Paper text:
UGPase is an enzyme ubiquitously distributed in all types of organisms and catalyses the formation of UDP-glucose, the key precursor of the sucrose biosynthesis and cell wall metabolism in plants. Among the various enzymes, UDP-glucose pyrophosphorylase (UGPase; EC 2.7.7.9) is important and essential in this carbon regulation, whereas the sugar, UDP-glucose, represents an important branch point in the C channel directing for synthesis of starch, sucrose or cellulose. To better comprehend the regulation and activity in the reactions involved in the saccharide metabolism, UGPases from different types of organisms have been characterized over the years. It is known that oligomerization plays a role in the regulatory process of these enzymes affecting their function and activity. Recently, the UGPase from sugarcane (ScUGPase-1) was characterized, showing that the enzymatic activity and regulatory mechanism are similar to those reported for other UGPases.
In this study, we present the first crystal structure of UGPase-1 from sugarcane at a resolution of 2.0 Å. The crystals have the symmetry of the triclinic space group P1 and diffracted to 2.0 Å resolution. The crystals of ScUGPase-1 contain two molecules per asymmetric unit, labelled monomers A and B, eight sulfate ions from the crystallization buffer, three molecules of ethylene glycol from the cryoprotectant solution and 353 water molecules. Similar to other UGPases, each monomer of ScUGPase-1 contains three domains: an N-terminal domain, a catalytic domain and a C-terminal domain. The catalytic domain consists of a mixed nine-stranded β-sheet (β1-β6, β9, β10 and β13) as a core, surrounded by six α-helices (α3-α9), and resembles a Rossmann fold. The C-terminal domain consists of 10 β-strands (β14-β23) and two α-helices (α11-α12), with the motif RFKS419IPSI, essential for the phosphorylation and binding with 14-3-3 protein, between α12 and β17. Hence, the uridinyl group is likely stabilized by Gly94, Gln169 and Gly198, whereas the glucose portion would be coordinated by Asn227, Gly265, Glu278, Asn300 and Leu92, though no electron density was observed for Gly265 in the structure of ScUGPase-1. A slight difference observed in the active site of ScUGPase-1 is the orientation of the side chain of His199. In the AtUGPase structure, the side chain is orientated closer to the β-phosphate, whereas in the ScUGPase-1 structure it is orientated closer to the α-phosphate. Analysis of ScUGPase-1 revealed a buried surface area of 480 Å2 between monomers A and B, and a complexation significance score (CSS) of 0, indicating the corresponding dimer is unlikely to be stable.
Author numbering: 13 to 45, 50 to 72, 76 to 261, 264 to 476
The structure:
């Protein structure tokens, strides 16, 4: 029994709590111990509710908001985009970080309705101390901000299936936060869940701190209160560029990810024709239901292995997803929302969009320029030279105007001046060894640039 050998070594660790050891051992048990395609059903409009059908007063809206807590997933670092510290503290636009804008937006909500919707940041051991220091700057803000630290699990050395860390030794490299599905046991273990319940809060709105579209939506909250759904996942129509989908399966809604799709149906799953929606990671969950299901040990989400290398040594990081929890909640639904609620910043190409003239900031909210009639955003592709935020900023003296852009692709050592306008289809391909400069004031429209001769 490899399970006993691992549980015994986990028990000797002194860096994490007994609750965390038990949760990790549980994940390992499921990992060590596929959907039936013919049973999958497309959700009806009663199971995935189109946003246009939602039922449309300051004081009554306060009564709704008084039941809400806003939780932002803040356990991840800015590594992908070349930044240290929490991903949420990268600057988005006009010097404001993701977390800055979240705070201003809740301040706006509190002012308009005379409420105090609490903000709860779910940190990880990778972000918690920095976030504690950072949230000192909101001390004078019209907001109640709290934080908690999610679970800390040991990485598993793949070769011998033993924990990487050891008793009484430091080192972040030995550990990992076990995904966003951990929000539910962590809300409980940290004590925040009992406090929220005791305060009369009833629903938590969960979202990634890097989704600029994930604002509190009164119509959605109103629907949940009126119909007592225990869980609502916001989905949005699939495009070619898109993720897990909601299905009806054995009489209730559940998330389906490609990992659970048998090989012979992966192409049908990946197609655009059968599944029309995907999960935005905007989640609304009933707090009493979480407590019930955490205490019943019912939240047995699919294990996501997420393997990694620590100084070239292969490790396992067993994780779970927050969206996968939906199949355990009663009266669970999807809501199919417009894509304006799905604006994740995952790459510097997304920063280009939000920092451009395509958007502006209005009281903390990211507002799309109405002069772009096309509701689709331009496609933007940049080479690895632009991967890191600082390098992306250096290579754009100003952000080009892209209101009329269809698509931009840039590769090679390219440096943009200021005051540039891009229209239609623009490709810029700097050949090997060429440091290509796009001049100040350039207008590029339906143009392929392959060298200085094209400028």
């Amino acid at each position: 029994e490899k399970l006993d050998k691992l549980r015994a070594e986990v028990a000797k660790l002194d860096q994490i709590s007994e609750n965390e050891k038990a949760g990790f051992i549980s994940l390992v048990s499921r990992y060590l111990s596929q959907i039936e395609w013919s049973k999958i059903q497309t959700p009806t409009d009663e199971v995935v509710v189109p946003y246009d059908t939602l039922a449309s007063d300051l004081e009554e809206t306060k009564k709704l908001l008084d039941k809400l807590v806003v939780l932002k997933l803040n356990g991840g670092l800015g590594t992908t985009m070349g930044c240290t510290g929490p991903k949420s503290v990268i600057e988005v636009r006009n010097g404001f970080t993701f977390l800055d804008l979240i705070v201003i937006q809740i301040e706006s909500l509190n002012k308009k309705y005379g409420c105090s919707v609490p903000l709860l940041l779910m940190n990880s051991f990778n972000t918690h101390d920095d976030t504690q220091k950072i949230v000192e700057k909101y001390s004078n803000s019209n907001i109640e901000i709290h934080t908690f630290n999610q679970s800390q699990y040991p990485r598993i050395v793949t070769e011998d299936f033993l924990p990487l860390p050891s008793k009484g030794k430091s080192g972040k490299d030995g550990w990992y936060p076990p995904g966003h599905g951990d929000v539910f046991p962590s809300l409980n273990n940290s004590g925040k869940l009992d406090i929220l319940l005791a305060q009369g809060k009833e629903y938590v709105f969960i979202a990634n701190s890097d989704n600029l579209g994930a604002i509190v939506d009164i119509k959605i909250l109103n629907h949940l209160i009126n119909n007592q759904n225990e869980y609502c996942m916001e989905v949005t129509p699939k495009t070619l560029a898109d993720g897990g989908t909601l299905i009806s399966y054995e009489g209730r809604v559940q998330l389906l990810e490609i990992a659970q799709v048998p090989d012979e149906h992966v192409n049908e799953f990946k197609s655009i024709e059968k599944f029309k929606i995907f999960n935005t990671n905007n989640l609304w969950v009933n707090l009493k239901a979480i407590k019930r299901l955490v205490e019943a040990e019912a939240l047995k989400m699919e294990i996501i292995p997420n393997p990694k290398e620590v100084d070239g040594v292969k490790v396992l990081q067993l994780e779970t997803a927050a969206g996968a929890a939906i199949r355990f909640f009663d009266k669970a639904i999807g809501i199919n929302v417009p894509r304006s609620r799905f604006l994740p910043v995952k790459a510097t190409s997304d920063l280009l969009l939000v920092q451009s003239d395509l958007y502006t900031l209005v009281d903390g909210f990211v507002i799309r320029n109405p002069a772009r009639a096309n509701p689709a955003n331009p496609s933007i592709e940049l080479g690895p030279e632009f991967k890191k935020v600082a390098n992306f900023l250096a290579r754009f003296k100003s952000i080009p105007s892209i209101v009329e852009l269809d698509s931009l692709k840039v590769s090679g050592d390219v440096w943009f001046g200021s005051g540039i306008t891009l229209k239609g289809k623009v490709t810029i391909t700097a050949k090997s060894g060429v440091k290509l400069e796009i001049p100040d004031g350039a207008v590029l429209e339906n143009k392929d640039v392959n060298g200085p001769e094209d400028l």
